[PDB]
Amino acid sequence: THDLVYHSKINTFVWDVEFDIVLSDSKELNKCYFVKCFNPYRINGKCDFAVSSIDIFSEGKRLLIENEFNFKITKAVHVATSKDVTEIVLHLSERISSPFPIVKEVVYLD
Amino acid sequence: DYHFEVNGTVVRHKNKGFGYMERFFELKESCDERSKLSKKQYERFNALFNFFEKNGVICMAKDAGTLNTSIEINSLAYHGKYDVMKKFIEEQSVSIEDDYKKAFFLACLGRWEESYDLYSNIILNSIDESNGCVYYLSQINRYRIYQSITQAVTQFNGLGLLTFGRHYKPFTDEFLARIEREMTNFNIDDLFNGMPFEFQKKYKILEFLSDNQFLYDDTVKLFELTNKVSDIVVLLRLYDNLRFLYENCLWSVSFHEFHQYIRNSMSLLIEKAEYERTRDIDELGFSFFGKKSGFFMEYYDFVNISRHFKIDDIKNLERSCSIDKIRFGEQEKIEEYLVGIAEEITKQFSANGMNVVFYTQFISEAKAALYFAKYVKLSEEGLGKIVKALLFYFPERDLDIGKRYVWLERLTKCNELPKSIISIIDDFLVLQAEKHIDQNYSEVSSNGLYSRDYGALIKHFEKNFISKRLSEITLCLTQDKQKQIDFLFKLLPLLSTNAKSHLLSFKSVENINDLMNGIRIGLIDEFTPEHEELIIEYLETRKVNYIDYMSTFGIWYFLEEINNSKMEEFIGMDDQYDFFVDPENFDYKKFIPSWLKNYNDKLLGKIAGNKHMKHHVIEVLKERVKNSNDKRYLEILMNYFI
Amino acid sequence: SIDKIRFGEQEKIEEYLVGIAEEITKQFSANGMNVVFYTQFISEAKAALYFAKYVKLSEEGLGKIVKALLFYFPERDLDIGKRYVWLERLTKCNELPKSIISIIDDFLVLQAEKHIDQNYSEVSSNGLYSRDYGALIKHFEKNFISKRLSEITLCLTQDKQKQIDFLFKLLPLLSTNAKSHLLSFKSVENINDLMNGIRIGLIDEFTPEHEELIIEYLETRKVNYIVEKEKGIQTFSSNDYMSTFGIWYFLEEINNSKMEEFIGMDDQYDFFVDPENFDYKKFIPSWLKNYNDKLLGKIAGNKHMKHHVIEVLKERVKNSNDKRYLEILMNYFI
Q1: A63 chain-B contacts, CB cut-off 8 A
Q2: Buried-exposed string B551-581: b where 16+ CB fall within 10 A, e elsewhere
Q3: Under an 8 A CB cutoff, do B630 and A9 touch?
Q4: List of chain B residues whose C-beta atoms are within 8 Å of the C-beta of residue C310
């Protein structure tokens, strides 16, 4: 739990951690992770408001299509270095009000 | 006995004997004193005059009226003249010093095996039948090349196999064994002591090279951050320490000790100059006395920044200080150097380019150069060649598609986009489309950006650019090439009207999930009534569930691109929805500041432009920033709400 | 915000400070100046009591520290203004027992007895003088009367000038009978007397005589500035009164329109007299840290002053490090 760093200008916790995924539809995904991209200088010509280009990797190579906003839950989540951190992830998932509270490697393209 | 100041002159100190230097400098100007000198010794005076004017010692301190030293480097390696060094290496060597610089150049092109062999040849042929300077230098360079080979082989064949798939073993195993055997227990500390006693008295100034750390000048660098309210004695020493190592063909210019203080001098100098500015403004005035920052980057400054800095270090430079206030001198020379880098990249990938050590040594400076290029006004042809190289011949193992797009957006900030650059980007998009015909090929990016941003940038710079090639590719589409249709969906604005008409029939809109898929890929621009009715049923479904995308619908309504009024009947639930649909009757006690951290420039501009929420939002932000040190809330407050 | 950073082991720091004070009170006042030692020890002592604002001190330690600072500290490194600044920042709000006030009053008595000769000038750097010491004494004990200085002014004659003026500058802390004794000795004739007495409350208004005196001083400054313009010398004295003069027009304290005829003398004059025609290019982003309450709100009360002050404040916030601009911006202008 020494690799978790909270970022301020975007409500996110960076942590090299993989979480199993359960969404509203029956399709289920194994341990995966998110990558957020804070870009306030992004081309938003259309009705785009988000400053974060948030996407998902399944196994570091499998980027799944966004499609609908799946109602994902953290389920069992592993740091892949020390031990399972399920509580340590779910406890700070709330009181954030930002989608994908815990991601890995925010790119911070300014 | 004499303090040779780096600014150009010399000052006296501890010369208990006669003042030979003062008399020499006095006779430098008087022609009669020159004439009265003896004939056999006159040529020696001429040689001394040539040496002293070359090294940059002008005059004494009592008459040092002119002291501006224009640094000049004539080394071929500094300017990255690879085409010249290759031709020189192909040319046979006539002497030993020419052989020495051939060895050094061979070391800078990554061919370390040939460089080591040629250094061994020099050692054999110049054992002691000279002044010994070449023998000493070629012993040190040999050891440094051996260290570099060991470090590369412990890393390239150690862990970096995935950087080229399978072990490329750039150095042969027999060669590795030979260099290990020939260099068992080579004492580098005592090497200078093994030289003849005459050498140790004459070339005493070459002692530091045989040391584990020799550049203990960093302790002097602590004078750059003293807050007493110059710095030119450090920059001149940096050039003084670069014209030695890079012009005497020495193999101590690629290690981490050299790169560490160059990354420390060039950072401390710019930071202190940034502190000289923004501090004189406090008591002198913004523009009445704020002429310039003080620092002036030149060709030999940009080259150092390119060669030694990394991307994270450059970003740290940009975050701390505003480099945009620092003008880049000698724009033409920077343009030519960048064009040379682009030519080298183009020639490297197009050819075999299997040689990997030089690739790794040179890709860093190439990336740093094309990163810093945004500060230099590049010529039209030069920019065209730069962009062509960066798009079609830069390896994808180092620069991903997202980083590639970031690089161009960085380059287009300080320069427009004439027809040539947009034509190059159009050709790149065409190449991507032709690559997408393979249904098993997918883009990999570590920045979130993709090929959509290229079309978006083209449209932003040119509102009516219709890529006829893309239109023809769309016309020639089939049903089974689903991935191609998706990719062309991502670039809808760049297609022609008949192309759009043919494409839209392939994939229509469905319910809300596909609706939002089309919105993300920009399928629809004006919200058609059918889309509007589809929206309501989702909200009507939400009411049943309540008795998500709701924030998106509220924001769209706030942006006035949704003109439906019956949705006004559906308020009193989510905070953001009511905020963006009915600011009149919102009770503001439920507002959360975190929302403001997800809004781009235009949304905050529209929020600030509205009267009914400006005061509430600004007082919320002030309350939040009073009790916290968050820079994001203050940044939002000052950029848009003042 | 070091003031909000906690300090540990305050007893050891108190012992260190008391040892430093003892060393300076022994070495520098017992013919043992030791110029060899007077190169690095005073640098440590200079940085010592500066960083003592954030450490609480006991009554005996505070007394020793204040005595060593005021009395035996060499004048070569610390002048009167720096000494006053350090004493001010060494005593926080309601942190002045009777002993410390007595020590300050003893310093003032020694200063008054040092001003018998007319040759003494009492030079400074930041312009703060013994009147500031009197203000400090009166701030923590408003109903504080003096006995030694009252005795000195009760044995005074209207023949010299330095002692009478000095005691007038510290008039508030004098007894009522002493005040009556001194007032008849020196009246308010010149502009400097008005400046000295406006901060201690003898005069509550600006009757046309004082305004006429100000106008006469302004005309003299005008002819002197013309002379300097011919000479080409930009003389900005440390003790000028242009800012002090303009400080009252902005507050409607002076109603004479004649001031509008001296526009262009000094940047603060144009800033405080005619905001509309002021050129918001020479504005120094450092005056804004010298107005506490009666001005910042009043500056924020103008239609055509915020629309130029806020840009300067925003710029100073963005690419500087000073925390004063931030609280100034969020305290009065927002």
Answers
A1: 442, 444
A2: bbbbbbbbeeebeeeebeebeeebbbbbbbb
A3: yes
A4: 642
